[PDB]
Amino acid sequence: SGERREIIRRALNKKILVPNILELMPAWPSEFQPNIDEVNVEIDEWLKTVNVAKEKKLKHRARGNYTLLAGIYYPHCRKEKMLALSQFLYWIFFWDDEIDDREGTILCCAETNKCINDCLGPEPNYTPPPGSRGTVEMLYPILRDLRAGLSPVSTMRLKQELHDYVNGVKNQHLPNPWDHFQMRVDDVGVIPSITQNEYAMDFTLPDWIRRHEAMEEIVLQCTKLTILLNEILSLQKEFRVSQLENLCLLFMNTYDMSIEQSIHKVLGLLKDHYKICIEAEARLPWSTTDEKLNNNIREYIRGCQRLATGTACWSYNCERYFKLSQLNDQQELLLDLSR
Template identity: 30%
Template sequence: MSTLTLNPNLSLPIFHDIPTSSNTSKKESLLRRIKGSRIFIPDLYQVLPGWKHDMNEGYPSMRDEIDNWLLSWVRDETERRRIIRADFASLAACLYPKAQPEEYRAMALYHGWIFIWDDVIDDGTLDDPKLAQYHRETCDTISWCMGPKPFVGPCPPTNGIMSSFIEIAKTIVPNCSQYARERIHNELQAYINTATWLQSKRQGEILSMKEHIEQRNQSSGIFPSIALLEYIHGLDLPPSVINHEAMQVIINKTCLIIHLLNDIVSFPKELADNQVDNLIPLLVHHENLSTQEAILRACELVRQAHLAFVDAERRLPVNGNIRTFVQGCKDLATGAVHWSYLSARYYGKNPIREGYKTFMQL
């Protein structure tokens, strides 16, 4: 098997490989321990006190247009059904409630694009040479669109997925400052590198808690969404603001909050696919908790991250653009919660609920 080569200029997390045979028995034991449990997921709106959720008013009128654009370059029928079920217009409406119509549309298309791009990685059908080629074509296209001289020179060879990214980028790039474009470019390249690298390394290993958090930070795709807030809200924040100690806390805690919440809502679905690369099973395994205790512990980790965010916000300079950016970070977090309740992706169409508390048997 060939070695997968990635961009040497971007650093990647180091996760220790675990022998497959040993880890398989641990994984099977962990699955047996969790499956069959009766659990509830608490009201997740309550883990982010003081933060309000909303919905972009453009959603009803733009949903069909957004779905039709995504479906126009996807031929696989299974993938087309998944796109319709996912409803990226709804996702973007939750994440970016204050975006203007053009920015809202661009973000819905972007989230649909990254979902489809990631599916190609996740389905496991690419061997190492094809995975390396997919990675290279993606990075070349992103750099051509968002590098130092956007859209200058010959367009790199593209397939349907990358051609669609070019169309999205042609909406975003002209409306970004140089610094914002650089941040979006760098965060996207880092995400693409890490997601590709992780696919080449996956053996079903049970990661440590620290490794899992580091992996999620790198591979969740949240940092690019945070960088895109400057485009969405027409901001031009200099590096001195982005690199401010309190702003870095806010950015990192936003990422942590969202991927912790995603682990909480997605673990029943992942468990059904015998996946344990999720915070809840790892808490059960490493901290010897029941499944319900692990869920409540994960919610407490979200609350702690929320408190750190709020504390950092107090240390920021008072500035209208900074406030807009920080509110955008809050919207990403509350939007992720709101979408989890609106979408059938995690719990199906008729979940058993008492208010916003969700009950299920695993």
Template identity: 20%
Template sequence: MKSQTTKTQLLRLLERLQYKLLSIFPRSPLPQTIKPNVHSDLRNEALTLATQLDGKTFRLPDLWKLFSEWPLAANPHAERLEGLVDSMLERIITNEKKLKALKKADFGRLMSLWYPDAEWPELEIATAYSVWIFVWDDEVDAGDTDVSNDEELARAYYQKSLSTVHRLLGLDESEGSQEIITQEEQSLHPNMALFADVGRGLRNSTDRIQRERFYRELENFMISVGVEHGHRMRGSIPTVEKYLHIRSGSVGCAPQIALTE
């Protein structure tokens, strides 16, 4: 099955692997005769290594063999999910070009494959979270936002997001916490609006221990994204060991697994 979704996910995977590849290849002085005319957004070591790799071929193994034992069934609510995802994106994305691109990514199809056996209430929460985390992460990674191009703004973005997540998960113990949650939901940044759906769903279906674990994993994810973003802004490349430590957090698997419970 060579669907557009598969192609989109592979492209995203390749983009995410970029920094790892750049950190693995050995460095050598860049020949003076080579003047890079691409990678204008990179600097220092990153620019040197990107120039050395420019034009090289990276071959993926046969992914069908690697994932041959994975279930291939789609959730029976797949078609309904497509409409849900479109409505979610329309709520939070005002840029028409970005909205069109995100709709084309086909999150509904992705969620129907991730959770083939989930019931509709569970799918709503999981889908709201997954769409939210992609949009939230793009604010830092896309390179076309103020946050993605300023380390201080990015740090403020993480801190504000975490405090909002903490309240919407019902983890604040201050008096009148429910009223605070209601006020929070009415004044959310567009990128956090979908998390109100996630928080509401989890407050009604999980206990505090589960929500605290989910919050801790999200916190680690955001911290790791911040560290990765800092390296990109400075044009520096961590060692392979440091990179693997950073990437184990910034890839976002842990909060997704905590939510899947």
């Protein structure tokens, strides 16, 4: 706790100007699905049905605005796609929020895994068991709808990915910053969103391509990029509740560096990972002849990239992490670690 106390003292009241993160990934553009407002209306009507407290749901909706995040993740999807994707994001955020006792966690995760199995499994049952908790009950219709837009191959991937995320959650002095990063890479719930691009754009990437070293690398780099940008962006929010296991903070503690230096390091890491990810593209098994196949490969990688850029763009466009007034019109964010 000496470590934590020192971290708090060093961080506290510091204001750091952060450059536009999107600039760090110049090749990858940020776009918005045209129907976000209309879909939001559907989502608002849908939210009333969901068994989570009205104030919590509104807080998520006003601060989070997950339909917008989905619109950013999948800007080119047909409008009909938007509802299920928006709904899933609401589920994942609600679910994470409710789970945050230990027994409660084991029970919810088991119930959640069961739902994932019932919905995405070989013998599909979309009916929630009676008395399902709200975060569980809501999931069944969403998985059924997503499955409807997915091939069995895409469905299998989604199922494993959802299991992996739920299990990671169940299985969660200061940790080494590198150790923290790796846990997040294994732990993070981004992958289901990448697979969801297949739903959004109604296509299936072949497993042989998905398992290719270059594709596996692009998925990994994009996962790393999303985590790294999240670390900086969420720093103010996390520090304020004294959640000191944030990578910027860990670098301060581990290397005895200033908060400014640690953020700079993370920014450099982003550039490094962006560069690796871009380099990986040449290595992909592009078809000499197949336009549809190459289109599928292109779409799939764009989905991964959007996970990184979109997460940052959405962060710059909602109030989950900081007051928007903290952002200038060059998209430069002034973090304030006043607590």
